Amino acid sequence: NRFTANVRGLTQAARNANDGISLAQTTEGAASEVNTHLQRIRELTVQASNG
Amino acid sequence: NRFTANVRGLTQAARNANDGISLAQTTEGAASEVNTHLQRIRELTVQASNG
């Protein structure tokens, strides 16, 4: 009984951790796109810093 | 006569003990089903504990 409970709990834990990985993946992808936006903004800032 | 009375009593006692075995079996089956439930509640609690 104890082993069955532990096994089901740990399988559900693996599912939860996979969900966490997927959430981190989405957040990281959006952050990378924001990173590209910051890169482009810095490019424009360097261009327009000229007189 | 004492032997006969004791023999009939012991046989009827064996029948009573068989009934006790069956009662314990029914209780054991019901408890096993409650256990199978509790595993599912535990797994779902682990699942929903994820934020």
Structural biology method used: cryo-EM
Tally Cβ neighbours within 10 Å of residue B43. 19
Q: Considering only CA atoms, which of B34, B48, B37, B51 is closest in space to residue A12?
A: B48
Tell whether the torsion through CA atoms of B32, B38, B43 and B44 is positive or negative: positive
Angle at B34 between CA B31 and CA B36, to 5 degrees: 115
Q: What residues of A are in contact with residue B50 (Cβ under 8 Å)?
A: 16, 19-20
H/E element, A20: helix A2-48
Q: Is residue B46 within 8 Å of A9, Cβ to Cβ? A: yes
Q: What residues of A are in contact with residue B38 (Cβ under 8 Å)?
A: 5
* Rounded Cα–Cα distance for residues A11 and B51 (Å): 17
- Distance, in angstroms, between A27 CA and closest chain B CA? 16
Nearest to B43 among A1, A8, A20 (CB): A8
**Which tokens sit at A13?**
């834990």
**Which tokens sit at B15?**
């029948």
